[PDB]
């Protein structure tokens, strides 16, 4: 219930999880649209983990029908691409990232996806979030 942006064909919102509460500050620019968009995304927080082997788990639900689960490696941990993936515990992290995609045909329904950040070897959830998308 912290942040939410209104675009032409999208309503997006997020909120903390129910069994984990660590603060993060995140947002993007501009409010994306469900076709080709270009822009940025800001990030600021405090690690609590080494962030060297960081990835995600995404559990997706397309209008009450489940899908399989998605896992996307974000920082391999060796000669990486980004700058924020070299941080240490208690060291402020602040950055901005560019992005651009194209778009496919998407059904008109109530989506949902839960997204959890996992460390690499001291496996533990750095944070959890509920993402709620409405395509319209």
């Amino acid at each position: 219930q912290q942040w939410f942006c209104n675009s032409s064909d999208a309503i997006i919102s997020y909120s903390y999880c129910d069994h984990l509460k660590f603060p993060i500050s995140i947002s993007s620019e501009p409010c994306i649209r469900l076709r080709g968009t270009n822009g940025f995304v800001h990030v600021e927080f405090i690690p609590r983990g080494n962030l060297k082997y960081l990835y995600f788990n995404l559990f997706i639900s397309v209008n009450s029908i489940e899908l399989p689960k998605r896992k996307e490696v974000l920082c391999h941990g060796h000669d990486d691409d980004y700058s924020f993936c070299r941080a240490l515990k208690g060291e402020t992290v602040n950055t901005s990232i560019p992005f651009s995609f194209e778009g496919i045909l998407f059904p008109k329904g109530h989506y949902r996806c839960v997204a959890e950040a996992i460390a690499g070897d001291t496996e533990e959830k750095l944070f959890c979030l509920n993402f709620t998308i409405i395509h319209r």
Binding site: V62, L67, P68, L105
Partner: protein
Amino acid sequence: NPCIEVVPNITYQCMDQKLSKVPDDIPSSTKNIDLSFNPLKILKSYSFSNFSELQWLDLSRCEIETIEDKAWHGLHHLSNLILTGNPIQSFSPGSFSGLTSLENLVAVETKLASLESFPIGQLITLKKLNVAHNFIHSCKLPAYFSNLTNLVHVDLSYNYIQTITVNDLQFLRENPQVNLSLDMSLNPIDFIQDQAFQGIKLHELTLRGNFNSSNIMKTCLQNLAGLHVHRLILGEFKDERNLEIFEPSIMEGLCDVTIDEFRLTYTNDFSDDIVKFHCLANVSAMSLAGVSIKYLEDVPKHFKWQSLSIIRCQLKQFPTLDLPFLKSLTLTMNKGSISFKKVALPSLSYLDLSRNALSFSGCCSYSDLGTNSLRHLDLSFNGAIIMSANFMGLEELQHLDFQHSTLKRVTEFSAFLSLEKLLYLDISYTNTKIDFDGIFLGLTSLNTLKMAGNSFKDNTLSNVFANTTNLTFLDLSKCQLEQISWGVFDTLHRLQLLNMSHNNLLFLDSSHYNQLYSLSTLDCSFNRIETSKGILQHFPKSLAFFNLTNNSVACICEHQKFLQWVKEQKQFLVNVEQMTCATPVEMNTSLVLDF
């Protein structure tokens, strides 16, 4: 008598018995007899008078040297006559007299010398006429061809023809309304008299294996003019001696003939330069098959091509093309492994890229072809096809086909999401662990679906076919299903077949099958059913077929209601006299059931 009957008084197949005479013991009113390799040194009169409906006679390698005056005396319906191999030094007048309705003739290998002394005369009906391997030296078409109001093919191949003169084809100049295809393949032509072809039209010409040197071919191809044709067949065969160098200027003197479909075949010497030679600018249907091409680069835009076809030609790259008039491209059975590349063809309505090991990575969107108005697509027996976008520009299609091709990433999103007009589909034998519902989503019209080899999640049918009303032919076979969830087949109002076999299913129910209004055939075989459980009355009335072979039926004093319902309606089942039952008493076809 001594020959081997197959069907009652039919197909007596009396071949290769050491005979010397037509057999008399043969029961009359037979259909198709067959003699071959039987020594009949002479043929005599009236021998066939008895038979009155024999309508397929063969005679081949039956050593014959003469025919009597009237040997075909009575034959009312004989729509065939083979005569191959029979050496007749010369024919005699008045032969072929008795026959009345003949629709074939094969005088091949006959020691024939000319076409003028051939006593055909008046055979009112004669569809074909085959000749080959004879001692002919001329090419003149005699005049008695005027009466045969139907003859749609002639063949003069493997002959000793040397020249062509203006005198021949004269009958064609006289008759402008005669359909006649032709062939003169394997003829050592070395001269064409000038102004031979003039105001003439055919339906097929064919020349393969004639020429020996380049200049001769130049001159001959030059001598043609004014001609009007419908199909050229040029090439050569890989088992003779032929050309050594092919020049794009050898086919000079070709910018004068009118053509509607050029067709090339295998050539020893070849170059990419042969195509798009400026005398091929109006060929309205290109074609080529067996040619050892390697690349296909830019082609001029001032061409008029309505069709292209490559078959069995090596191609180590997907060639680029740009022709604002071509349609119906076809490439199949390629001898190599390639990878799709974008093209541009502003008006295409047919495509077939099958039985090639083709990998299509960024799959199936508008930009890969840049067109509308596609009608038939087929990528079958190919390799891995990574799905990257649901079909977005191709909003009009009619068929679609994968047969043996590992189709990847089908379940990560709802593919086939925009094919609102479809009438056919085939996902068979593509390993696909269906674990996402709503996969067959968004496609309303679909009157066929074939899902033969496809696993499932924890082996159960689970509410897949929804919003798929119009769907008459369904098929879920050969796939391991250890049970069935409650609620499938809810709305298949129009479903007239349901194949389900070769899967392990201990029992079946009657709570299903409850809403199928018009279901005619229903196979359920090889799936070891023990007994029904429903009311056994709640089936649909419009039901005509079943199939219960190879089922393990509990035969020990239980569920006797089913055990009698099976023993009442033996009309709808099949082989009702062949069921056994699996008891502590085995190895006995016990179908007593005294209860």
